[PDB]
């Protein structure tokens, strides 16, 4: 009542695109327990790396790394199908317990972070300062990753659909589509959002027949 | 310099799950133009409805509706493949121009909202008050929709994979999988997050062979 034990900065993990995904928001009073389910970025991925982060930045690299661990034994499956439940649990003592559990296999791996770990009081103040100073740059970074991830899904999906269509897909169409896919994959390797969007657009313009078949 | 023309509340649209997705954040100075690409929720969906919202609530229904319009002519395609670019553009006069463009067909539909539309000064204050009053309830709603949407993807994907596997999928497996899919679909129709998660878990526990084949 006179005081409150609170988390000075956000706590979360690094997700595809190098972005920090928050599990426990800034100024949350502890004890607290939050969870979210994630999945694999690649087909047949056998493990996921849980990189714990403390901070207010959108770029995972600009945040304080609290540590990392892997969860392996993930059985063969298309990307995005596995269910890896990640739980952040801060107890009364202020100790953070992070766990990752594969819902198919039931396997789990944990990392425990002492209450004194993370950033100190001044550093916390600097983090809040920088986050505010770089609010626009972070917004730009967030939309870039949104674009890159959408393009990756398009690339990955389209390729699956082409295979599944086989001879159903006319030669003219498959030629246009595959050129656009190669162009898209090259774009995804860069940092130019407009370029990525341009290649997704080209793909959308030449995939109409494929989409009809896949549908 | 002495003053700044700013957006008092967030502006965005309603996305699947009845959640408000922000395009232009609160306290943004105008003129400003932001965009984001969305897609269809269902296979062969021929149109998307753009419901413009003003407010700070996570539930679209708890926000101020500025209006809505449809973009039709979307060609047959699997759900999540179409690219509908939605742009929010507020000019110097304070007029909001919202557009939706299908990148495949190039078709576009717009709605223009006068600067005097939306919520008035007091209402703005009430909106900020309520958003803060319901920060937890909104968090719960957000995670519920995250869960429901993840389950929907699982349901939809699994069904596609079962078809694509055909005889490759053993009878015992297909029986377990399809029961779990029916159970999952029922859960998705409710508001119980744990129940939805339970059915996704069951599906993850009996789909191992399917996942191997689909992979």
């Amino acid at each position: 009542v006179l005081l409150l034990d609170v988390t000075p900065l956000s706590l979360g993990i690094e997700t595809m695109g190098g972005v920090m995904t928050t599990l426990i928001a800034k100024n949350t009073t502890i004890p607290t327990k939050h969870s979210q389910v994630f999945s694999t970025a690649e087909d047949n991925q056998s493990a996921v790396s849980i990189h714990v982060l403390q901070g207010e930045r959108k770029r995972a690299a600009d945040n304080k790394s609290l540590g990392q661990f892997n969860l392996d034994g993930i059985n063969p499956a298309p990307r995005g199908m596995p269910q890896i439940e990640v739980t952040f649990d801060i107890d009364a003592d202020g100790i953070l317990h992070v766990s990752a559990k594969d819902k198919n296999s039931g396997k789990e791996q944990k990392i425990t972070i002492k209450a004194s770990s993370g950033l100190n009081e001044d550093e916390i103040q600097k983090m809040v300062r920088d986050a505010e100073a770089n609010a626009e740059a972070d917004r730009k970074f967030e939309e870039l990753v949104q674009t890159r991830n959408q393009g990756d899904h398009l690339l990955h999906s389209t390729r699956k659909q082409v295979e599944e269509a086989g001879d159903k897909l006319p030669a003219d169409d498959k030629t246009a589509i595959e050129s656009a896919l190669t162009a898209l994959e090259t774009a995804l390797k860069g940092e130019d959002k407009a370029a990525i969007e341009a290649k997704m657009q080209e793909l959308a313009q030449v995939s109409q027949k494929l989409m009809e078949i896949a549908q | 310099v002495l003053l700044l023309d700013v957006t008092p509340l967030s502006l965005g649209i309603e996305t699947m799950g009845g959640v408000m997705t922000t395009l232009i954040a609160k306290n943004t100075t105008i003129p400003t133009k932001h965009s984001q690409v969305f897609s269809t929720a269902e296979d062969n969906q021929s149109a998307v409805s753009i419901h413009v919202l003003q407010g700070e609530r996570k539930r679209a229904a708890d926000n101020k509706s500025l209006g809505q319009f449809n973009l039709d002519g979307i060609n047959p395609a699997p759900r999540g493949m179409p690219q509908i670019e939605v742009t929010f553009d507020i000019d110097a006069d304070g007029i909001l121009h919202v557009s939706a463009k299908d990148k495949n067909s190039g078709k576009e539909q717009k709605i223009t909202i006068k600067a005097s539309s939306g919520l008035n000064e007091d209402e703005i204050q009430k909106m900020v008050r309520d958003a803060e009053a319901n920060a937890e309830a909104d968090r719960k709603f957000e995670e519920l929709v995250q869960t429901r949407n993840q389950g929907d993807h699982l349901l939809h994907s699994t069904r596609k994979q079962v078809e694509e596997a055909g005889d490759k999928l053993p009878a015992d497996d297909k029986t377990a999988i399809e029961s779990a899919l029916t159970a999952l679909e029922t859960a998705l129709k409710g508001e119980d997050k744990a129940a939805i998660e339970a059915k996704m878990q069951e599906l993850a526990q009996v789909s191992q062979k399917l996942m191997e084949i689909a992979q």
């Binding site: 993990i13 690094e14 997700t15 595809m16 995904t21 979210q36 994630f38 999945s39 694999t40 970025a41 690649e42 991925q45 056998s46 493990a47 996921v48 790396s49 849980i50 990189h51 990392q68 892997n70 990307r79 995005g80 890896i84 991830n149 | 949407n149 993840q150 993807h153």
Partner: peptide, 7 residues
């Protein structure tokens, strides 16, 4: 639907 890499 958020994905994780393998390092």
């Amino acid at each position: 639907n958020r994905l994780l890499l393998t390092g």
